Design a protein around this ligand. Structure first.
Ligand SMILES: OC[C@H]1O[C@H](O[C@H]2[C@H](O)[C@@H](O)[C@H](O)O[C@@H]2CO)[C@H](O)[C@@H](O)[C@@H]1O
Ligand code: PLM
Ligand code: NAG
Ligand code: NAG
Ligand code: NAG
Ligand code: CL
Length: 778
């Protein structure tokens, strides 16, 4: 029942707050206006957890990334309202075909000069140096602007041909970057000259340059419309004009459109759209803000038709069309950080123009932290994870999505462990990989008592459990028929005569007070409860937003072996119903469900497999046979070749390496699976394999059971006439690709047979998957 707004402190917050009081007048809703430091990236963190302001104000360049992460709500404007604003302003706030924010103002930088000191402002950048020396004789300077933010330096960088990214037939091509172009080098090299010819100071930030121009110590500055207000109260005659040209071509400022976005987790979205559509985006509202600190050009054609008469706004628009309109694609944050570091370093002489800017082509589209090598060193997105020793399993634990057990068996879990040491577990089964159509549900009741740490599985806790009962409920009329029949064949006599099962009725499959049981029919076992591990992550170091993950024992890939299978690895984690990720919608749906009302998971569309690229593990993976490992895969779709790195460790946190395997080969794209809905079949050939021992124990064993092996030396295992390996080896694989909540792609490969054997025959292809790998940059 409130409205919180975040706006940068270089804009008119008090003006916006006054459009807010009129909201309080007509509707009685408080509007609170805050200008947090570095708000552009306070927003991604607080919003990801469900928190944050209701409305976020920023240029369009950063909103595409917010939307990709699911932080922005789609805005619902009437076509009548949409006509009020200019089409290009809407085009800037459009991501993936959806409108994601309300356009407010069009901003571009311009040349601001003191007419008293400089009645005729320079027309070219190259005449600035001589101009400097010979105002320098009067104890003044020619040009001073903020060199700490690349927004103020870009105009010069783009003049000769430096292009942030390439616009190709309606697309911005992140594979065509021009920060290391010859054109970019010229602009930065020129800037460096002035910084080295004592014409400009490397330290100069916004505050320093603003103080100088507004006190007449410099004759020129580069700034935006927001800056005009203070100069106006600086008793200094000043003019706004076109930016100096560089090497005959004009300075190209990056054009940004100030926009208001509605938090995807806002409880007051109708009020937010109400405040923006009918209070702010009005001739009265925009004026109230433009009086505080000028917005320059505006998106409302009504007000724009009037402001365009002010010559400052016209120069703003002249430079804007001389410039380029910022892309909203999510790679902008990495583009800005790379160009930022380039400028600060070359200005400081830390890196040669070419060298500093050379890195900008290696860091433009992706953060260094998104590269495969960093992700391997900092797992879980560099989260700290605290392991609960001894674990506490009390609470409600739910699945995070549509799990796949071997079979395939598409299912979700809902497990309640009580303080009396008793438990009620729901296993919901479905007919598809979307978990939208329940087939049958299992209700498992019994008792569980945690023991002590496992000496077999490092990081696991052993547990003892006892079943009291297993019941099954069929949710379709067909399932009741099929299962009753399957129960009949499997245990002839379990079903009394004329007892065809009916839907929505719980039937006993296992009672501890009887020797009559047919758990074999569904190949049921509950040995997952014998191995337990809890991992916590406290986001923002707070108990709230804490994510608790419960890891239970893994399921055998062969259903007939589950009764005897004695866990050595983990199932995918469950999350605590009270302490889960805000983006987990499945958690809540599963939490609010029961044996008679199964959880219906949100529909997501099957994605098409695009192996091209590099993929790495997200966590220290645990494979059957207590094997800790991470994986790095490189897929060449150009020649259908693949390389894989398997890094093995002895600890559940993957810090003590033991051995490393390198494999390379060829793969054949295959057919969509009919056995495993949502999966695509593949055949992989391993042609080459290299082994690197990483500890003395592995080197010793290799030397004993065998080119002598030593720690850290990679050795091919195929000589010309090791451990008995047989290369070439053929593998029949199953693959699926999905997208996580902030739009990163996940690659799932076939679960490795629980017995340790290989899928070396088509009938041995997996019907389940391993934990997903995430896409990374090289
Ligand atoms: O310098 C990189 C940043 O450029 C723009 O930030 C501008 C912004 O558009 C303007 O309203 C503000 O007041 O000035 C800053 C530059 O200091 C992008 O919008 C940012 O996302 C970039 O990081
Ligand atoms: C992924 C298909 C080929 C896998 C063969 C690579 C060399 C075999 C040694 C690694 C163990 C098998 C694990 C492969 C499964 C995977 O990690 O994707
Ligand atoms: C254990 O506690 C739960 C929660 O109060 C309750 O539903 C269940 O019946 C209890 N069982 C026993 C044996 O006390
Ligand atoms: C159970 O299976 C047996 C053998 O397949 C069959 O003869 C019998 O008819 C089945 N039960 C029913 C009631 O169909
Ligand atoms: C496949 O292509 C990659 C790069 O596209 C190259 O490095 C590799 O040598 C090629 N392999 C074969 C067998 O053509
Ligand atoms: Cl992709």
């Amino acid at each position: 029942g409130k409205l919180v707004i975040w706006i940068n402190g270089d804009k008119g917050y008090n003006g916006l707050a006054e459009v807010g009081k009129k909201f309080e007048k007509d509707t009685g809703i408080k509007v609170t206006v805050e200008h947090p430091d570095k708000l552009e990236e306070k927003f991604p963190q607080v919003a990801a957890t469900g928190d944050g302001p209701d409305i976020i104000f920023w240029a369009h360049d950063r909103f595409g990334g917010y939307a990709q992460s699911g932080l922005l709500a789609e805005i619902t404007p009437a076509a009548a309202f949409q006509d009020k604003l200019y089409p290009f302003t809407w085009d800037a706030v459009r991501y993936n075909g959806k409108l994601i924010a309300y356009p407010i103002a069009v901003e571009a930088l311009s040349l601001i000069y003191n007419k008293d000191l400089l009645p005729n402002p320079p027309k070219t950048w190259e005449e600035i140096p001589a101009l400097d020396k010979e105002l320098k004789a009067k104890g003044k300077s020619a040009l001073m602007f903020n060199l700490q933010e690349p927004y103020f330096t870009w105009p010069l960088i783009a003049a000769d041909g430096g292009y942030a990214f390439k616009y190709a037939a309606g697309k911005y091509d992140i594979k065509d970057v021009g920060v290391d172009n010859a054109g970019a080098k010229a602009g930065l090299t020129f800037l460096v000259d002035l910084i080295k010819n004592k014409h400009m100071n490397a330290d100069t930030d916004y505050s320093i340059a603003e103080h100088a121009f507004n006190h007449g110590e410099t004759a020129m500055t580069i700034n935006g419309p927001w800056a005009w207000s203070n100069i106006d109260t600086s008793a200094v005659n000043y003019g706004v004009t076109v930016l100096p040209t560089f090497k005959g071509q004009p300075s190209k400022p990056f054009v940004g459109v100030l926009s208001a976005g509605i938090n995807a987790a806002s409880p007051n979205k109708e009020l937010a759209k109400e405040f923006l559509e009918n209070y702010l985006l009005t001739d009265e509202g925009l004026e109230a803000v433009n009086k505080d600190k000028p917005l320059g050009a505006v998106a409302l054609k009504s007000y724009e038709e009037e402001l365009v008469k002010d010559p400052r706004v016209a120069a703003t628009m002249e430079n804007a069309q001389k410039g380029e309109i910022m892309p909203n694609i999510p790679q902008m944050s990495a583009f800005w950080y790379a160009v930022r570091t380039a400028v600060i370093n070359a200005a400081s002489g830390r890196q040669t123009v070419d060298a500093a800017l050379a890195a900008a082509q290696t860091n433009a589209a992706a953060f260094k932290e998104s590269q495969c090598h960093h992700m391997l060193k900092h797992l879980h997105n560099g989260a700290r994870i605290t392991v609960q020793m001894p674990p506490t399993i009390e609470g409600h634990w739910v699945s995070t999505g549509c799990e796949v057990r071997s079979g395939p068996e598409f299912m979700t879990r809902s497990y309640r462990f009580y303080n009396n040491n008793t438990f009620k577990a729901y296993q919901f089964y479905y007919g598809s990989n979307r978990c939208t159509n329940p087939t049958y549900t299992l209700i498992i009741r019994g008792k569980i008592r945690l023991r002590q740490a496992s000496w077999i599985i490092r990081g696991g806790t052993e547990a003892d459990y006892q079943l009291h009962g297993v019941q099954v409920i069929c949710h379709t009329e067909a399932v009741a028929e099929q299962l009753s029949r399957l129960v009949n064949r499997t245990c002839p006599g379990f079903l009394a005569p004329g007892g065809p099962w009916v839907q929505d009725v719980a039937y006993d499959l296992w009672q501890e007070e009887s020797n009559h049981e047919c758990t074999k029919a569904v190949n049921f076992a509950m040995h997952e409860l014998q191995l337990i591990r809890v991992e916590k992550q406290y986001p923002h170091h707070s108990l709230d937003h804490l994510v608790e993950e419960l890891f239970l024992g893994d399921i055998h890939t062969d259903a007939t072996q589950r009764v005897f299978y004695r866990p050595s690895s983990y199932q995918p984690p469950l999350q605590n119903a009270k302490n889960h990720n805000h983006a987990c919608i499945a958690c809540r749906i599963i939490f609010r469900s029961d044996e008679h009302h199964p959880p219906i998971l949100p529909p997501k569309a099957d994605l098409t497999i695009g192996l091209h690229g590099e993929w790495v593990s997200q966590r220290c993976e645990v494979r059957p046979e207590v094997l800790f490992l991470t994986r790095h895969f490189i897929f060449h779709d150009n020649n259908n070749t693949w390389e894989g790195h398997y890094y093995h460790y002895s600890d559940p946190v993957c810090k003590h390496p033991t051995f490393t395997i390198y494999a390379r080969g060829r793969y054949s794209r295959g057919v969509l699976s009919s056995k495993v809905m949502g999966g695509t079949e593949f055949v992989f050939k391993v042609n080459h394999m290299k082994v690197t021992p990483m500890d003395a124990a592995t080197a010793s064993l290799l030397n004993v059971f065998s080119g002598s092996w030593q720690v850290g030396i990679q050795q091919d295992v195929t000589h010309t006439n090791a451990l008995g390996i047989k290369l070439p080896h053929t593998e029949y694989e199953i693959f699926k690709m999905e997208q996580d909540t902030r739009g990163r792609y996940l690659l799932f490969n076939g679960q490795r047979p629980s017995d340790g054997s290989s899928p070396d025959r088509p009938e041995k292809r997996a019907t389940s998957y391993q934990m997903p790998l995430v896409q990374c940059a090289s």
